[PDB]
Structures are given as C-alpha cells and as structure tokens.
Amino acid sequence: SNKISATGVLVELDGDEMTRVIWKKIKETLIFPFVNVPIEYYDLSMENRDKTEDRVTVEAAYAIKKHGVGVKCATITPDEARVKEFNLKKMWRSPNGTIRTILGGTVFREPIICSNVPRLVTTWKKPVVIGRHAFGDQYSATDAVVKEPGTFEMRFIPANGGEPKVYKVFDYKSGGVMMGMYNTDDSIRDFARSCFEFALARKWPLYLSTKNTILKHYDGRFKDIFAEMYKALYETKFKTCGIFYEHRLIDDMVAHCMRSEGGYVWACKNYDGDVQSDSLAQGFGSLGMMTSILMTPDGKTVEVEAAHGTVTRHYRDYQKGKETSTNPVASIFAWTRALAHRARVDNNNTLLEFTQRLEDVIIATIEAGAMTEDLAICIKGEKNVVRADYLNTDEFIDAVSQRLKVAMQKS
Amino acid sequence: SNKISATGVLVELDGDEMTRVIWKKIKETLIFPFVNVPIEYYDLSMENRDKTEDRVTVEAAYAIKKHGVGVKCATITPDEARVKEFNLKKMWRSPNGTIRTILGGTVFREPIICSNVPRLVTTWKKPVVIGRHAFGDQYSATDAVVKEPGTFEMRFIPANGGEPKVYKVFDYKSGGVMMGMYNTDDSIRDFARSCFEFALARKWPLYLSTKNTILKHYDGRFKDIFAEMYKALYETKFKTCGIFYEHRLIDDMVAHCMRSEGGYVWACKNYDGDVQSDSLAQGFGSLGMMTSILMTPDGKTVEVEAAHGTVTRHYRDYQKGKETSTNPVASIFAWTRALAHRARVDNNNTLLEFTQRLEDVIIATIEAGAMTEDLAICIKGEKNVVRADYLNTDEFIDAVSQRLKVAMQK
Numbered sequence: 001s002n003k004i005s006a007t008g009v010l011v012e013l014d015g016d017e018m019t020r021v022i023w024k025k026i027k028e029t030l031i032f033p034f035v036n037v038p039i040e041y042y043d044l045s046m047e048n049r050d051k052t053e054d055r056v057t058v059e060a061a062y063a064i065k066k067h068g069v070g071v072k073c074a075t076i077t078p079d080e081a082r083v084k085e086f087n088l089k090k091m092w093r094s095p096n097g098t099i100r101t102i103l104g105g106t107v108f109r110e111p112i113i114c115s116n117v118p119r120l121v122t123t124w125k126k127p128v129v130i131g132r133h134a135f136g137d138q139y140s141a142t143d144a145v146v147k148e149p150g151t152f153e154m155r156f157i158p159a160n161g162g163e164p165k166v167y168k169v170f171d172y173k174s175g176g177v178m179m180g181m182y183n184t185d186d187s188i189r190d191f192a193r194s195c196f197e198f199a200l201a202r203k204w205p206l207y208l209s210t211k212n213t214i215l216k217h218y219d220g221r222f223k224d225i226f227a228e229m230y231k232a233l234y235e236t237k238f239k240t241c242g243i244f245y246e247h248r249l250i251d252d253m254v255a256h257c258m259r260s261e262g263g264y265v266w267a268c269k270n271y272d273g274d275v276q277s278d279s280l281a282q283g284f285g286s287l288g289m290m291t292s293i294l295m296t297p298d299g300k301t302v303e304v305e306a307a308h309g310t311v312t313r314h315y316r317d318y319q320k321g322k323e324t325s326t327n328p329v330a331s332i333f334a335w336t337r338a339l340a341h342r343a344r345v346d347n348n349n350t351l352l353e354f355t356q357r358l359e360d361v362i363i364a365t366i367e368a369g370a371m372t373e374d375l376a377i378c379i380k381g382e383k384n385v386v387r388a389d390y391l392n393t394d395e396f397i398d399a400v401s402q403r404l405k406v407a408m409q410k411s
Numbered sequence: 412s413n414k415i416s417a418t419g420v421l422v423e424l425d426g427d428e429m430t431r432v433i434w435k436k437i438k439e440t441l442i443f444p445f446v447n448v449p450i451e452y453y454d455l456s457m458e459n460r461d462k463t464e465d466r467v468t469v470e471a472a473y474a475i476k477k478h479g480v481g482v483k484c485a486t487i488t489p490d491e492a493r494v495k496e497f498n499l500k501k502m503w504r505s506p507n508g509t510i511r512t513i514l515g516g517t518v519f520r521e522p523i524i525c526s527n528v529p530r531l532v533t534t535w536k537k538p539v540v541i542g543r544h545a546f547g548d549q550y551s552a553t554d555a556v557v558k559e560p561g562t563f564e565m566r567f568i569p570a571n572g573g574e575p576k577v578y579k580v581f582d583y584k585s586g587g588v589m590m591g592m593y594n595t596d597d598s599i600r601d602f603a604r605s606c607f608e609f610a611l612a613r614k615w616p617l618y619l620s621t622k623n624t625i626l627k628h629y630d631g632r633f634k635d636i637f638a639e640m641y642k643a644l645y646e647t648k649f650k651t652c653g654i655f656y657e658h659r660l661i662d663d664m665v666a667h668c669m670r671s672e673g674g675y676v677w678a679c680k681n682y683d684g685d686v687q688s689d690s691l692a693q694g695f696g697s698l699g700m701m702t703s704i705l706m707t708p709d710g711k712t713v714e715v716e717a718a719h720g721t722v723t724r725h726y727r728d729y730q731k732g733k734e735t736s737t738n739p740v741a742s743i744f745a746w747t748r749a750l751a752h753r754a755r756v757d758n759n760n761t762l763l764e765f766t767q768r769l770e771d772v773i774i775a776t777i778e779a780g781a782m783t784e785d786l787a788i789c790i791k792g793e794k795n796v797v798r799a800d801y802l803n804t805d806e807f808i809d810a811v812s813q814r815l816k817v818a819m820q821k
C-alpha cells in the first residue's frame with residue numbers, strides 16, 4: 001500500500017473559471033497522492049482556445065479516440081458577450097459540440113444520490129440516466145416565415161438522377177410558418193449502438209422514447225432501428241445480464257419516469273433530450289451532483305466530465321478574494337468515473353477499487369453532515385440556510401481527504 | 412332555504428359507464444337540492460350516440476355555442492372491441508373530437524389540490540394550468556424515409572405567381588428520414604387569445620414556452636404573435652389584476668415548473684403540451700383531481716369535463732354488485748366550474764357563491780379526513796390502507812352533502 005497507478009493513459013482537458021480552480025485541488029489532494037497513471041495533458045482554458053484558433057480542442061478530441069479515456073473540466077462556450085471579455089477572432093463554437101462530434105456517439109447524464117439529500121420527486125429512489133441523440137432533428141433544420149399566400153411543398157431529388165419525389169405539405173391562405181428537418185440512418189444507428197453499449201456496461205435496462213404514433217415513418221425509423229439492433233447483437237446479452245429494452249411513446253415515458261423509483265437508461269431524441277434533461281437536473285436536486293459521460297458506439301472509448309458549467313458567479317467571489325462553496329463532487333466523480341474505465345480495460349483491480357473507495361467516501365461524508373452550500377439548500381431550502389450549515393470548497397475536500405485516508409488503512 | 416335558481420341556460424352532456432352512475436348521483440345530491448338550473452340535456456351515452464347516429468353529439472355542441480356553457484360526463488370513444496361489445500353500426504369518431512371541432516378553442520387542465528394529499532413533487536403548492544395548442548405541428552406534418560442518396564429540398568411557391576424560394580435542407584449519402592411541418596398565423600393567434608382570456612379570468616399569470624433559440628422564425632412567430640397581442644389588448648388588464656405574461660425557453664419552463672410553487676397558466680405548443688400534460692398530471696396525484704376546460708378565444712363559450720375517462724375497470728364491479736370507490740371531485744368540479752361560468756356571465760352572484768362553497772367544502776371534507784380510495788393511497792400506502800381510511804363513492808358524496816348544509820350559512 002503506497003501509490004498504485006495503471007499503464008494505459010488518461011487524457012486531461014483543463015477548462016476554465018471556478019471549475020478550473022477545483023480541478024487543481026481535486027488532483028493535488030484526492031487523486032495524485034494515491035494514483036500516478038501517466039497522463040497526456042491538454043489545456044482548453046479559453047485563454048488558449050483564442051491563442052490556438054480553437055485547435056487544442058480538436059487535437060484533444062482525437063487525443064481521446066487514440067487513448068480511450070478522457071477527463072474534461074468545464075469550459076466557456078462563447079456568447080458574443082464572452083468575446084469582448086477575453087479576446088476576439090471568431091466567436092468560437094462549443095468544445096463539447098466539437099469533441100462530441102469528433103468522437104461520435106452519445107452523452108449520458110447521471111445523478112449522484114445521497115440519503116440525507118432529498119429529491120423533488122418523492123418516488124425517485126434510484127438514478128435515471130438520460131442519453132441524448134444530439135444530432136439532426138429540430139436543431140439543424142431550416143425554418144421560415146410565410147407572409148404571402150402560397151404552397152409549402154417538399155422535394156426529394158435523387159442523386160443518381162431519378163424522379164424528383166414531390167409532396168404538397170400545405171396551402172396557406174393568410175400567413176404562417178414552415179420548417180424542415182432531417183436525420184440520417186448512420187447517426188441514429190450510432191445513437192443506438194452507444195446506448196445499448198452504455199446500458200450493458202452499467203447493468204441497467206433501457207427505454208427509448210419516440211412518437212411513431214404520429215410520425216409513422218420518421219420516429220418509426222428510430223424504433224425500427226433499435227428493434228433491428230437489439231435483436232441482432234444485444235438481446236441475448238441483455239437476458240444474460242438480466243436486463244431489457246423496450247420502446248415508449250414519449251408521453252408514457254415522462255409519466256413512467258416521474259412515477260418510477262428509477263434505475264434505468266433512457267434514450268431520448270435530440271429535442272426530448274434538451275427538454276427532459278433540465279427537468280431531471282432540477283428534480284434530482286443540485287446540478288453539482290451529476291456527471292456527463294460520452295461513450296462511443298464501439299463502447300470502448302469514453303470522455304467524462306461534470307454536467308454543470310464553469311460556475312461563473314462563484315468565480316467572481318474567488319477574484320473578489322471571498323470564500324466560496326462550490327460542489328467539487330461531480331468533478332471528483334468525473335475523475336473516478338474515467339479512471340474506473342481505464343481500470344476495467346487494463347484488468348486492474350487496485351485502481352478500480354480505489355475509484356469505488358473514493359466515491360463511497362464522498363457519499364459517506366455528505367451523509368454524515370459535511371457538505372456544501374448547494375446541498376445544504378437541497379435539504380433545507382434557499383432562503384433558510386446559514387453559514388454553519390455547510391463547508392467551503394476547501395474544507396469539503398480536506399474533509400473527504402481525511403475521511404479517505406482513514407478508510408485506506410482499515411481493510 | 413330559498414334555492415338559488417338561474418337566468419341563462421346550461422348544457423348537460425351525459426356519459427358512459429361508471430361516471431354516468433356518479434353523474435346522476437351528483438345532480439341528485441349535490442346540485443338539484445341546492446339550485447335550480449334550466450338545462451338542455453343531450454344524452455351522449457354510447458347507446459344513444461348509436462341510435463341517433465352521432466346526431467346528438469353535434470346537436471349538443473351547437474347547443475353549447477348558442478348558450479355559452481357545457482358540462483360533460485365521460486364518454487366512451489369507439490375503437491375496435493367497442494363495436495363488438497356495443498354492436499355498433501359504424502365506428503363513430505370521438506365525441507370530444509367532434510365537439511372541439513365545432514366550438515373551436517383551446518383546452519386547459521386545472522388540478523385540484525388538498526393540504527393532506529401530497530404530490531409527487533414536494534414544491535408544488537398551487538395549480539399549473541397547461542394550455543395545449545391542438546393545431547398541427549408534427550401532428551399535421553409529412554414524413555417519409557430516404558433510401559437513395561439525394562437531396563431534401565423545400566419550396567414556398569407564392570400563389571401570386573411570384574418567384575418561389577427554395578431551401579436545400581440536406582444531401583443524404585446513406586439513407587435517412589425527412590419531415591416538413593407547418594402552422595397558421597390564425598391558429599396561433601386563437602391559441603393566444605384563449606390563453607390570455609383564460610389567465611385573466613383566473614387572475615393567474617401566463618408563461619408561453621418555445622424553442623426560438625433554434626427555430627428562430629418558427630418558434631419566433633409564436634413569441635411574436637403573443638407579445639403583439641399582449642401589449643395591445645392585455646397588458647393594461649393583467650397589471651390591474653396583478654398578473655403578467657412572459658415568454659420562456661421550453662428549457663426554463665420544465666425546470667421552473669419543477670422548482671416552482673406554481674400558480675400560473677403555461678401555454679405550450681402541440682407536442683410540448685402533449686408530453687408535459689402526462690408527467691404534470693402524474694405529479695399531482697389521481698386523475699380524479701383534475702378538470703378539462705375548453706375555452707374559446709373570445710372567452711364566452713366554455714365546456715368542462717373531468718380530465719379522466721369512464722373508469723371502466725370500476726364499472727364492471729358496479730355491475731357485479733361489489734363496492735366501488737371511484738373518486739368524484741373532478742366530476743363535481745366540472746359542475747362547479749361550468750356553473751361558475753354560467754354565473755359570471757349572468758352577473759349572478761348567488762350562484763357564484765354556491766360554486767365557491769361546494770368547491771371549498773369538497774376540499775374541507777378531504778382535508779378533514781373523509782376521502783375516496785385513491786386519496787387514502789396517496790397519503791398512506793397501497794399497502795397499509797384499510798377500509799376505515801376510505802369512503803365508498805356514494806357514502807363520500809353523501810359525506811360532503813352533509814357538510815355542505817353545515818356551510819350553507821349566508
């Protein structure tokens with residue numbers, strides 16, 4: 001028992017504002033002492049994404065697909081406002097959207113529950129993991145206003161040169177609005193792969209929601225694919241594990257979700273993902289207890305982070321010079337969740353267990369009362385919380401450290 | 412003991428299976444004792460709908476227009492197995508379907524809340540009234556699979572001969588899928604009118620939710636036509652009553668809805684309303700604690716029912732002679748909401764007083780501790796619920812009957 005390590009490689013992406021300052025402590029205090037895995041490092045501080053024309057970003061994305069596991073701190077996705085603050089060049093796109101794209105596959109959000117920390121939905125006793133397809137659909141579609149009377153028609157035009165296929169969609173007598181969207185069989189099939197794979201690892205059952213009732217052909221295509229794919233390559237594997245796949249009309253699924261105790265992976269389409277994920281986020285409690293994880297369709301490759309932002313407001317009090325109480329846990333979990341993936345590919349039970357023992361030690365700490373402002377507010381309530389109801393970011397980490405070292409001995 | 416009577420008229424639409432049995436009970440015990448109402452009765456039982464050949468259903472809908480208010484008992488929609496059981500001549504369309512067509516307007520699901528009945532969401536203290544926009548987004552869209560590589564295009568082809576405008580949406584390479592969809596300015600302008608009408612009438616605020624961050628023109632047109640109407644007709648009136656309107660990203664609204672004490676109307680688009688309504692209504696408890704209410708855009712014609720069906724599972728036990736404990740408040744509250752409209756239109760304040768007392772007393776009765784089998788299940792278990800904890804349908808109604816008199820004190 002000293003420093004244990006493992007000979008694959010983590011790929012660290014460094015990120016900015018408050019999350020950045022926590023990254024730096026997490027590492028020093030809770031991971032580097034007891035683990036020394038070799039690390040290809042990158043630095044996606046917006047500081048540097050302007051200094052490198054958003055090109056450490058794309059370097060780092062492929063950096064992961066090579067090595068198989070990544071940790072990302074949260075980063076600033078530029079608004080137009082953001083440009084004036086730091087620096088000009090292009091008002092850049094979101095690193096998350098870039099890496100997600102380069103790696104293929106799908107992001108899965110996971111709450112982290114404690115017993116003293118209540119939820120808003122009384123029935124939820126277990127984690128509901130939403131996985132979001134994040135491509136096509138309403139998000140890359142053409143929209144338009146209609147001011148004349150006229151027709152809105154659609155044309156499919158064969159590439160080989162066959163019959164344009166034409167559909168009268170509607171004839172406007174006054175004014176209105178109009179829109180078209182696509183999706184591709186490849187992006188869906190990859191969503192499906194990534195999902196089936198994700199539920200299978202974590203030993204949970206799997207729902208996908210559509211509205212094929214209404215959209216017989218478009219939503220059907222999704223249903224029909226997961227149906228196609230489940231029975232080809234996974235059903236047998238599911239039964240062996242003892243889990244399942246089912247499909248639901250979205251309206252069931254949200255009823256089910258609400259009324260069910262939890263413990264499942266929920267495939268959502270791109271818009272159902274944006275919409276539901278905010279509900280869960282608020283509902284489970286603090287966004288500071290949630291981890292995004294990015295899985296590839298081959299299942300063998302991953303990039304995990306927190307599911308919150310950089311915490312700008314807190315960062316401002318860091319600069320003011322003031323004390324702060326940011327939840328480092330999603331971020332700490334980020335590390336453990338990753339490291340645990342690197343452990344299960346290296347056949348490494350020393351590190352694997354340390355990732356369990358740290359996650360257990362964090363939960364047992366919160367459950368014994370030592371927690372942060374945000375979680376104090378989950379138990380008590382925003383207006384009714386006071387200083388000696390929580391710890392600052394520093395004290396939490398040094399509280400979980402000391403608790404950790406004692407449980408490292410007794411074994 | 413004078414008994415309140417009325418001046419204008421009220422349309423009773425009568426229903427099917429268990430709720431028809433409960434409907435009769437409420438007029439016998441809770442209504443015709445305490446108030447006299449000129450009623451136009453149309454019976455919309457499945458049998459009668461068959462005999463007349465859906466003729467009464469239409470008959471009834473026009474009546475509502477003429478008079479300005481409808482109360483509706485739950486009615487069976489004809490599907491396959493229903494034609495065999497009922498020996499139907501022709502699988503008649505849904506009656507609400509038929510009715511909502513003729514009247515027009517927008518439905519609002521309002522839930523009934525009781526101190527002692529916990530919700531699934533801890534933060535909810537007051538109602539959250541979703542208004543869904545029926546007219547098709549997705550629900551009137553065209554969709555088809557792409558097999559060949561090729562190109563999805565869109566044309567707007569002006570009816571005045573002018574030069575069309577194309578839009579290349581996508582070039583497929585493998586196969587995929589394509590959808591095109593629409594909405595009218597007028598359909599949205601009537602969704603709006605109705606929501607503003609409703610929110611003012613209730614004295615609640617109104618959130619409109621859309622995704623105009625992405626659908627800048629499409630979901631834009633919703634945001635726009637609302638605020639056009641807001642600060643032309645309604646902003647003076649809402650501020651007087653101490654309410655407001657505001658737009659929000661659909662992302663806010665679900666998160667707000669969750670964090671929020673509540674007490675507002677939420678208008679949302681067809682799809683956004685369909686999906687939420689079914690989690691929302693699960694969160695609040697039994698289905699017997701919610702009312703539906705169509706309100707046309709002027710705000711003068713209205714038609715109100717329970718937000719639940721005919722509860723057939725229990726109608727089989729009523730047939731067999733076993734005790735039943737269907738919950739009646741939704742059904743009752745359809746009567747009180749409908750009369751409450753009838754009353755507000757007749758500037759008729761003695762009836763308005765009744766509609767209030769009955770609503771308040773029904774809550775009192777449950778709050779106190781007499782309830783139906785669902786509400787004991789909410790409070791106590793599913794297990795650990797014994798017979799002393801719930802009244803049967805009849806003996807519950809008759810339990811508020813008493814307490815109504817006890818508070819028939821003005």
Ligand SMILES: NC(=O)c1ccc[n+]([C@@H]2O[C@H](COP(=O)([O-])OP(=O)(O)OC[C@H]3O[C@@H](n4cnc5c(N)ncnc54)[C@H](O)[C@@H]3O)[C@@H](O)[C@H]2O)c1
Nearest residue numbers: 074075076077287288306307308309310311313326327374
């Ligand atoms: N990489 C990512 O996961 C990600 C996701 C969304 C937004 N962002 C970015 O984050 C920045 C800030 O945006 P935001 O307003 O959504 O902020 P945020 O998501 O960091 O936090 C939202 C609010 O919730 C609270 N909160 C969230 N996480 C917390 C934690 N761990 N501990 C304590 N409190 C917490 C904060 O008080 C904050 O005001 C933006 O520049 C945006 O581009 C990043």
Ligand SMILES: NC(=O)c1ccc[n+]([C@@H]2O[C@H](COP(=O)([O-])OP(=O)(O)OC[C@H]3O[C@@H](n4cnc5c(N)ncnc54)[C@H](O)[C@@H]3O)[C@@H](O)[C@H]2O)c1
Nearest residue numbers: 485486487488698699719720721722723724737738739785
């Ligand atoms: N007129 C309408 O607005 C309307 C709406 C929905 C369904 N229906 C009709 O009713 C029939 C059956 O519908 P369904 O069974 O799908 O839904 P339902 O509302 O009849 O009942 C479904 C379940 O909900 C429960 N439920 C509903 N109201 C209840 C109450 N007051 N107390 C206790 N439990 C209650 C029942 O226990 C039942 O198991 C169908 O033939 C349909 O056409 C009519």
Ligand SMILES: [Ca+2]
Nearest residue numbers: 274275278662
């Ligand atoms: Ca969102």
Ligand SMILES: [Ca+2]
Nearest residue numbers: 251685686689
């Ligand atoms: Ca629904």
